[PDB]
Amino acid sequence: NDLRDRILSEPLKHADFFNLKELFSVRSLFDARVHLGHKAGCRHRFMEPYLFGSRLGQDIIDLEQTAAHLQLALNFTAHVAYREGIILFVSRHRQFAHLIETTARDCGEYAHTRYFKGGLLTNAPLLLGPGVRLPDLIIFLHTLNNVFEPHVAVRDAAKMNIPTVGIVDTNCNPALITYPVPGNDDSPPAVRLFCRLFQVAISRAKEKRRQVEALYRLQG
């Protein structure tokens, strides 16, 4: 029990416990076209602080703020995976649906890139089963559906008190997302980079949970 408290509280005392600072950098993000955005006309009002500027009507996302947000997002993602937490990948975009679905399978986590039913997260007992454990974290690789409206899971997750780590483009609403990561979600190199970063972040969290467990077993 006390040692069970020790292993749960051990990674809370180190900011760089998982050594995630070496996975990415400003140069790495730049080559993935993460600093590009939509036209100036589609600029959402809440994304103004996260915009470095506009280049000939094309918004440019400030990667310096992206790196600060992404560092916390990956750090937060690993810790909830370390504590045996359910992670759901949600992305309603019909160009990376297979890639995101395969990404979750490799990490061992769940994905939902299909049509989102109305009463899924809220009326969980009727949709899924009598006793269902709700996901402890939701990852949004795209916060918009195919009709350019905010995704339902963004609103429902806030109702059920489920933290959401979602990539927000220049036309998204980061208001309800607790860990927004301003970036590009349209270019294939950008979307592939985010999946791989969350692939290694989960795998390291799963492995380092097992390593400390082995040390605990030989402790007593």
Partner 1 sequence: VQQREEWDRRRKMKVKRERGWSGNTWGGVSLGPPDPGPNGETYDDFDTRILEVRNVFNMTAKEGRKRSVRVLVAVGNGKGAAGFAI
Partner 2 sequence: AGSRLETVGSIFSRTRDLIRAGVLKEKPLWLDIYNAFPPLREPVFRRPRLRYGKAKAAVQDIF
Binding residues: 38, 169, 185-186
Q: Is 178 in the site for partner 2 (CB under 8 A)?
A: yes
Interface ranges with partner 1 (CB under 8 A)? 125, 130-131
Of the ranges 72-80, 90-98, 109-117, 186-194, which one interacts with partner 2 (CB under 8 A)? 72-80
Sequence-distant (≥ 6) Cβ neighbours of residue 137 within 8 angstroms: 77, 80, 85, 86, 87, 88, 162, 163, 164, 165
Q: Which is nearer to partner 2, 144 or 162 (CB)?
A: 162
> Rounded to the nearest whole angstrom, what is the least distance from the CB of residue 203 to Mg ion in the complex?
28
Which residue of 91, 103, 113, 173 would you call a contact of partner 2, by CB under 8 A? 173
Asked if 206 and 108 touch (Cβ cutoff 8 Å), the reply is yes
Sequence-distant (≥ 6) Cβ neighbours of residue 160 within 8 angstroms: 121, 122, 134
Asked if 136 and 143 touch (Cβ cutoff 8 Å), the reply is no
> Rounded to the nearest whole angstrom, what is the least distance from the CB of residue 76 to partner 2 in the complex?
6
> Rounded to the nearest whole angstrom, what is the least distance from the CB of residue 31 to partner 1 in the complex?
48
Q: Which is nearer to Mg ion, 137 or 177 (CB)?
A: 177
Binding site as annotated, residues for Mg(2+): 38, 169, 185-186
Residue 173 DSSP SS3: coil
> Rounded to the nearest whole angstrom, what is the least distance from the CB of residue 125 to partner 1 in the complex?
6
Asked if 83 and 202 touch (Cβ cutoff 8 Å), the reply is no
Sequence-distant (≥ 6) Cβ neighbours of residue 181 within 8 angstroms: 66, 69, 70, 73, 165, 166, 167, 168
Tokens of 47: 């994304």
51 binds, among partner 1, Mg ion, partner 2, none (CB under 5 to 8 A by kind): partner 2
Q: Which is nearer to partner 2, 97 or 158 (CB)?
A: 158
Q: Is 169 in the site for Mg ion (CB under 5 A)?
A: yes
Instruction: Report the 10 Å Cβ neighbour count for 161.
Output: 7
Q: Which is nearer to Mg ion, 62 or 186 (CB)?
A: 186
Tokens of 170: 């220049």
d(CA 182, CA 87): 20
Q: Which residues bind partner 2 (CB under 8 A)?
A: 8-9, 12, 15, 40, 43-46, 48, 51-56, 59-60, 68-69, 72, 75-76, 79-80, 83, 85, 122, 136-137, 155, 158-163, 173, 175-180
Q: Which residues bind Mg ion (CB under 5 A)?
A: 169, 186
